[model samples]
Target: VKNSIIWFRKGLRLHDNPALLEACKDAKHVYPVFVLDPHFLQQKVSVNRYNFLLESLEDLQRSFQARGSRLLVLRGKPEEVFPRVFREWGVTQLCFEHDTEPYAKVRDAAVRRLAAEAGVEVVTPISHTLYDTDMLVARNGGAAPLTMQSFTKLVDRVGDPPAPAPDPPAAMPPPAEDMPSAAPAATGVPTWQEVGFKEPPLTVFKGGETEALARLEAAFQDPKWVAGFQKPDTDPSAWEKPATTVLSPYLKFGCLSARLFHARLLEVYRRHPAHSQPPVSLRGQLLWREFFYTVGSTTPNFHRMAGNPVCKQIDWDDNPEFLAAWREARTGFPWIDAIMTQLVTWGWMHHLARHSVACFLTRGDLYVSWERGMEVFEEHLIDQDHYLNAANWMWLSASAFFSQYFRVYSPVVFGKKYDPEGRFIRKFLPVLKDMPAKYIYEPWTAPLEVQRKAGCVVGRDYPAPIVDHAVASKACIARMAAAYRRS
Candidate 1:
């Protein structure tokens, strides 16, 4: 009787999971396990994201139970735990999804070496991304594509992504029944406290494949919305009713397969031949994610500016007061402050909103280090992907990928462009809810009489602007030009 152990990582869902399917193919008995590495659990993870992970794990356990199996939850490093499991369970084969992040690549190499030493066969299938990043890089002359056009061209050469793998079998083979009685017990699903965290406030975004697939189906049901979706055209200020599909968090957690989403999107596009196209369209959004993954996987020191060959290092300010004000949503610019508040409270924000805040932190006003902003996002964002987070901060800060540093987003005018009524600002910054639309974006500019009538003074009630936008912006631009020259 062949026995196999399927290790669950980011690819939590059973649907379109190649690794899970392969694990069940010929094995008479299968052990599905999820190792809770101290690397993640010990770090300061956002409680919101932690809750989402727990919810997804619990849902996966249910999927396993329905198929006459259970998910084995373990606590330890994969290197230390897998060897023991292989010996104790008498495992003949191991299986898991492929990961491409820098750390994951190193960790996986070690695990593969351990499996080889233990004489256990290992099967790793690409599932998390639409295409294998290494293949994409190889097709681009052993380097990741830097521009969207180059990326699209290489993808065209590599052909389309393989169709998503079939779902898990309805009846799963049971694990070895005669296993040692001292084996670790399956804990079903762990709570936040079990993993060391207080229960976070209820989030609008829930986890699990059930919820992910339901949302995907609902989004595709409106073929018009899916077909005509242009990312830039979407309203960034639509806080109440988000214009873009909120499937990012789901995609981030691997609750939904990227290939499945790409296939479904193409089906919608086929119906409307003249629909929006890449770089700005709904399909373009996925490509952007792939682009970042490719770049991050290939580049070294991608998470930081120092010693990163691809990044142009610039002298950034070490102003604790400026960074603190920005992080705490006390920047005194209602538009910037409101966006920060939303990120802190809900753990998500619109892409343009993110761009605005990032610009403000680095090249726009504060002239602070992009690394600092990147760290904060890593801690706060519910949908944070290592590659995407780092790549985006670089692009926004004009350190890499993007070069249009002169085109900085104004905290006051940019928000006003999308939301003339300042509805998004009002929602997130309730203190400014009663302020007139004219002064909502720049409350400090409002006269004393207007401030009194609105019941919120700029200095005492709220706060004053941290820096003069015009002066700071000019200084930042000049510094960036000098940095480019030095580079």
Candidate 2:
């Protein structure tokens, strides 16, 4: 009888998990293992993200136990960890879901080498994304699709993504008694302090497959809501309850199957034929993610502007003061500061809010660098995905993907348009709660009398505008035009 182990990486759920089912397919015994890579853990990952991952693992362990099996948790690099277990457990097969991130690509390659040398069968199914990105690239003559138009064209040619894989069976095979023993005193998910981190406060989001399914059900409850929803039309000012479904964190963590979400959205659209369509629709949202994944996987040096063929390099400012002010949410632009505050406190903000801050960092005002903004987001965002973050930063900075270098988002006017009364600003920046709407977006514009009445002195109670947006924006546009000409 064969014995196999399912390596649980991104695909944490049993539903639509092909790797888990494949491990149990013909094996008399199966083991589910999750390796906590010390290399990644030591990288100072966001506390919120780390906690979310641990929560997902905890939920996954319960799921395995419910099926009369247990999830094996270990800590180490995969290459160093897998070889020992493969020999000790007499594991005939190693199975896992495919990942397309640059680092995962390298890590998986090393694991595959070990599996081959040890004579262990390897099975990897592509299920993390909506479509197999490799196939999408293959159809593009072995090059990555650069734009959404190019990506969508190839997608049409490849036809629709395959149907979601079936759920795991009611009863999973029990792990063999002779399974390899875990490291000394290593058996379960570890605590924050145990891994050299001071525990961060609990995030608003809790991660897991169960919560993901529940959220999906809630989002799909109203067919009309699902049909009429458009990403651009949503109000970013509604931070109390974001206009869009807050399911991104779950999707990012693979707590929910993207294919499953796509299928459900299509079903809702079919019932309501007048629904919104792509580049805006719920279906379009998934495709947007796929587009970024395709571009990032194939783009070398995708993370940094330097050496990144796709990203445009610019002579950005080396001013740490500006970056620190931006990061600490004291940019002096009320709109920019409030959003940054929300990001740090809640680990999330509206998409347009992200756009505004990103624009300000690179092209609108600071003229610092998108790379700086990207790094900060990586350290704080709960829904951070490697490829998506890089692609989005490029889009926002006019460094790649989009080319509206001249079109800059006004921190003052943009946020004011969505929140005329500055309710959002008041919520996050309570210092401005008493400030009138007229001066909310630009408190420095108010007279001393108005400032005193509002109990907020622009220079003392609140900061004055850091840089004159009007002047900074004009200079930024000129710089971009010159860069464009040189390129």
Candidate 3:
């Protein structure tokens, strides 16, 4: 290959970029291009997610420029823009990392079709997930595993993933001259003001490879912590320092490689013989991510309840009022509201906390469709991966992957189990800060004198529980059981 284009998508970093390395190896000149697709550019994503992507792109550009190359940012759909680049740059080969989500599959297929039409040889590498989707399916009777045990057995047979590829060449070949017809304009990292939003007071997770590597080191600094990490044991209430490592955004953005993360965990595990086991351990989280992607890749209408085969069809309520309240953090359940408040504020929340809110929205009390909740997550979540978002909503809502519809997450009682002191509630929902611990979980139950002393009136200052949890959850449980009987 004389000239090649390494189309940058989610795999944003220079590390473990097999496709990028392959493009550079055989080609005299390699151009790394990022298409500013209108699909995600103009709408859908929240401002915070947009800015994180901008920062990641900015960091990538910095890395390329430092290595005597540059990242080309072109505006348009990838299919429209890439043909121009192929013709303009005299490109002969196209390379990119594989994406397995349903939408990504369609997008990638379209790009491949056009690239074939343009007489360009395309080489797509599977480095995002530890195991290739097709290979995993083939290993398991030509279908993705439906249960964790089967997926785990398949994974065990496949064994460890290949080690991550080396970093980009220190001194890279020069890119093609004056790429775009109008010349690629530079937008040095889009700012909050540039994006028409006020500067955020604080950002918990910064984007890019520079910070991603730092996060990796920080997470595995304590070998014991990494070794003993278990999902169920984590405290959802501890916000100052989250029980689980907040490296998901980095992983989602491809700032950090899954192989490298797996390697790191293995290194820690080797030191300590008695470590946590799978389905809940640190390594299991990575597998769950893969599980979501694998199922998502093959399932029909994986994002919705209507057409998906795995998703349980139920007569979900269409209460825009309940959905709006859930999204706006005014659910009147302090635990639920506080969790949503944290999500909107930081663009992230604890996993179990997510379970609480998702359950509350759907089968627990509100009986709203999981799709509405999933849509809100898409807009607000910093690590907005469609595969995880849809599948998890399905899991938590008992729509798919999980079928324990009889068990419900109590908006009040659940949070109190994790945080009896109401510290988590107070952190995100400070309006209830002055209430006593006895009534903190149920402030509406406080006496007039107690409410007076607390200085936060239940109905006036804060909302009463939108729906009585005990009453609502009980009926919803029966409803799901009834629906299950029909199926």
Candidate 4:
């Protein structure tokens, strides 16, 4: 009997799961496992990230149980745990999907090596991508495509793909009667006492496979919102909020399948026709996700400066005080403070807000490393995608190829453009709520009595400007320009 063990890493759902499907096809019985790697929680992860991840894991357990399979939970490092499984099950093979992040790639290599040495075959599936390896391979067919259009053209060659896998039956294949006897000890996993953090309020974002399917249905069906997808990233209001399908977190965790989403988008396009402005654009975004993943997989150190060379050259601040103030949302700049506040409170930030706030820190305040900014944002971004997170930070830090040399965002200007009435600002910055919409972006400039009438005490209620914008802006530019040329 070809019995196999399938490890479910990021790929949580059963639909279109290349690893899981391939395992089921190859073996008579399949054991699906999810290891709750403790390194993640110990890392600089924030409360919001924990909430999203833990909730997804909990929901995934239910989904697995319904399918007649149990999601065996493991807590220790894979190297230490897998040996026990192999000895207990007499497992002939190990199977899993791939991950592209630097650490994941390295860890996968080690796991594959260990499995091979143990005389067990390690099967990998082309499960991590929407665009297959052939689609991403460069003109020479050996290297990954670096540009978007080239990648898109290759993807288009697929013409049309098979429809996404149907939802896995709430029933899964039964567990092996002679499965491994021992389960992971539950005691080692950290409890609330061991991990002390000020538990933040739960975010409104729903997690799990069920919620993911519901969102896709709602977003495609809502006529008012479907039209907004024409330019989801542009309009910070209508297109930004509930209009765009917020599937990044789901995609990141594999609670939802990209194939299902891509197919659904095309179906919506054909059905809605002119009613849907540009379904192609939505598909393009999906492809972008794939593109970044390919880049990350091929260039393992992508988060570093070489993939985006300009990052090395851009001099950023190494100011602990500035960094602390930024993290604390006490930078005294209303616009900067407002962005941080939204991040801490919502665990979701509009793309515009991400770009604007990143530029504010790198170009406006003159920080030294985009890595620092990337680290901070990654800590809290619930959808903290591996490639997307790194790529975006580099773009905002003006380290990417497509970025402009002088696309620096003026927080004051950005405030006027995105939050004209200061409604968004007020949502995060209660201290500035009373200020007139016009002066909220620059309270100091207002007449003293206007400030008084607004009941805004600049240094008390709302902190005063931490850095003189004009001086800081010049300093940031000077440092960055020098670093850019040098690096």
| Candidate No. with top TM-score | 1
lDDT of 4 by residue, 228-297 (tens): 3654445443323643567888888887888888787776667665643322377777877877777666
* Per-candidate alpha-carbon RMSD to the true structure: 1.7, 1.8, 1.9, 3.3
Residue 321 displacement (Å), model 3:
1.6
Global fold similarity of model 1 (TM-score): 0.96
Taking the tens digit of each residue's C-alpha lDDT, what string does model 3 give over 1-487? 4898898888999999999998988578888888775445444566777778888998998998899988877767886877777788888889999987766778999989888988999999999998887899998898999988789999999999889999878988768676554255552345556655555624567889999999889888889988888899899898999889888898899999999999989988998998997889999999999888888888888888888889899999999999998989888889888989888878888899999999999998999999999989998889989889998998998878789888887788887887998999888888889899999998989998998898889889998878888899899999999988899
Kindly list the per-residue Cα lDDT of model 1 for residues 331-365, writing each as its tens digit. Answer: 99998999888887888888988988999999999
lDDT of 2 by residue, 1-487 (tens): 7889999889888889888888998878888899886556654367777888888998998998899888888877788888898888888999999998877889999999999999999999998999888888888899987878777778878877878889898888877774446532575887666666776744687889999999899888888999998998888789867888888888888899998998888788778989997778888889999999888888889999999999898888898999999998988999999999888777888888898999999988899889998899998888988998999998998989889888999999998877899999999999999999998998988889989998999889887777998999999999999888899
In terms of lDDT, model 4 sits at 0.69
Question: Model 3 — which ten-residue stretch has the worst lDDT?
Answer: 181-190
If candidate 3 were superposed on the true structure by all CA atoms, what would the RMSD be?
Answer: 1.9
Per-model clash counts, in order, read 0, 0, 0, 8
lDDT of each structure?
0.87, 0.86, 0.86, 0.69
Model 3, CA-based lDDT: 0.86
